[PDB]
Amino acid sequence: GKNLTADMSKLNISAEIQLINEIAHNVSNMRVEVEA
Amino acid sequence: GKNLTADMSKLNISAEIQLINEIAHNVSNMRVEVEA
Amino acid sequence: GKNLTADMSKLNISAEIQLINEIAHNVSNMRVEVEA
Amino acid sequence: QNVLVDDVNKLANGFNQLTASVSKLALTTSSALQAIQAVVNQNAAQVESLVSGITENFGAISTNFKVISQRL
Amino acid sequence: QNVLVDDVNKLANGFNQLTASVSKLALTTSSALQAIQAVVNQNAAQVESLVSGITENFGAISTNFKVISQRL
Amino acid sequence: QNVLVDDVNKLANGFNQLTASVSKLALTTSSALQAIQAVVNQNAAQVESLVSGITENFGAISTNFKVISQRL
Ligand SMILES: [Cl-]
Ligand SMILES: [Cl-]
Ligand SMILES: [Cl-]
């Protein structure tokens, strides 16, 4: 028989998750008020 | 030998999918017309 | 024993990836300047 | 005070452009998410189905060793 | 030159609406991405753990054939 | 009728800010999606490759039982 090996990739999108959270915070702090 | 058990996680992002569809509907209904 | 078969699904979202890249290019080319 | 009227026009069109493409962005993201869910869950189901099959095989193998070890 | 003031009002509200929902869009996308990462990585870990177990079993099976083949 | 000119300025900058970050949002989403596709497909390929290997092993085991059961 054969020597089973797995070698599974692991997903790393922590930066994208965190950068998208920062976008959602920088927007929504972009309200535009007016007048007097 | 060993007692192989799987215990696979299943992905549930139906709410996020559906909430993103509602965003795409609430936008695009945000056209801004003008004049007279 | 049994005849193990895998039948693994493969993910194809190349169109969505590419269409989202085109959106990011069509935005950001939407700067609005003014005056004289 | 003449450019104001043109500037309101420019923002209007740019706003309606932006919303249209934010709309498209959300739908395209939704479509990717749906495909990912379907594939990830199906691949999980297969692995589960696979382990059941592998367990039946190991049981049948274990049975064979026991039958031959005592019938010997 | 009277509609300008109303038009500035309309763009203002539409802009604050758009930003609020772009905000929501980003957060909801972030939330989907986080769930996908957790599930994909856990499913990978299981397969790895599974192959280790399958390898122990094949070793024990290989040992049994050798013990019985020479003790015969 | 003096605030109109300042208000057009405010919307202008806020619009160019919003588009810049909607741009960033799309690119970052694209980048996450690309990584997910690569990982999900590679993990699928491994499982497929793994099952082939497990099937070769079960065949070799089945052959051994048959050789020893008739040579006995
Ligand atoms: Cl699509
Ligand atoms: Cl949520
Ligand atoms: Cl990035």
Automatic annotation (TrEMBL), chains A, B, C:
Gene this protein is translated from: S
Residues of the full protein shown: 1023 to 1056 of 1128
Organism phylogeny: Viruses, Riboviria, Orthornavirae, Pisuviricota, Pisoniviricetes
Protein source organism: Rhinolophus bat coronavirus HKU2
Protein name: Spike glycoprotein
TrEMBL record, chains D, E, F:
Residue span, Coronavirus spike (S) glycoprotein S2 subunit heptad repeat 1 (HR1) region profile domain: 1-72
Protein's name in the database: Spike glycoprotein
